[PDB]
Design a protein around this ligand. Structure first.
Ligand code: ZN
Length: 258
């Protein structure tokens, strides 16, 4: 019996094994666009994914991760509210059972169909494991997904989902370009937060882009064909694998724009 997104092991139950779930800087949160203040101190955001090297995609029973080789600086996130260099290690999504829900962060209480998380770790800490134990160990770039026109750059991911339908399955996923999942604008909100899945460590600086990316109903539908369960077990569709907005507490969300 471990955490999940069901009625008996969902987000509302996590605090029993991970007390920090009721912490002071938990994620996700609702982004109140009218309360978020433009911050002149924020430097230009730098997303350098030209040399990104994907290696594999796996269904870990919670979502599916596209993993990258982070043994060198090839795909890094810099600038903005960040100091130093954060290296891309993996990206995954959260999505709903219906188009009206799925995202973890919300904008003026609006829920998007899904949310993409590109996870990067601070190189000053040597590795991902050491980084998550630091308040500024991770930077996560969040991007909202809405249903509309298809996203060409996401199809490659959609095409391999059939091969990793159940928990534990992985497949070769080399030469995938994450630049194809980015919206036109890099305007963003930023605040100090946590991982949104157990162990919910508060080591995340959050950078959530204002502009969502459009994906086709067909693309999202394939996401919903994945399974939380392992092969040969009763089918539980992998849907609504998102954590709800958490108390903002003593935090301020800063905007990179006006
Ligand atoms: Zn996530």
């Amino acid at each position: 019996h471990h955490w999940g997104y069901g009625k008996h092991n969902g987000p509302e139950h996590w605090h029993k094994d991970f007390p920090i779930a009721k912490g002071e800087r938990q994620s996700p949160v609702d982004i109140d666009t009218h309360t978020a203040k433009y911050d002149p101190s924020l430097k230009p955001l730098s997303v350098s994914y030209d040399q990104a090297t994907s290696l594999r995609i796996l269904n870990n029973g919670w979502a599916f991760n596209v993993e990258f080789d982070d043994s060198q600086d090839k795909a890094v996130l810099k600038g903005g509210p960040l100091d130093g260099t954060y290296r891309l290690i993996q990206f995954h999504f959260h999505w709903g059972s219906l188009d009206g829900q799925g995202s973890e962060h919300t904008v003026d209480k609006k829920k998007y169909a899904a949310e993409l998380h590109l996870v990067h770790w601070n190189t000053k800490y040597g590795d991902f494991g050491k980084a998550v134990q630091q308040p500024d160990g991770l930077a996560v770039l969040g991007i909202f997904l809405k249903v509309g026109s298809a996203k060409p750059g996401l199809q490659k991911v959609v095409d391999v989902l059939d091969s990793i339908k159940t928990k534990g399955k992985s497949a070769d996923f080399t030469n995938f370009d994450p630049r194809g999942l980015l919206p036109e604008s890099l305007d963003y909100w930023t605040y100090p937060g946590s991982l949104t899945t157990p162990p919910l460590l508060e080591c995340v600086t959050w950078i959530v882009l204002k502009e969502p990316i459009s994906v086709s109903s067909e693309q999202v539908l394939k996401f919903r064909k994945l399974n939380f369960n392992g092969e040969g077990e009763p089918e539980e569709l992998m849907v609504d694998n998102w954590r709800p907005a958490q108390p903002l507490k003593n935090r301020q969300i800063k905007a990179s724009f006006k």
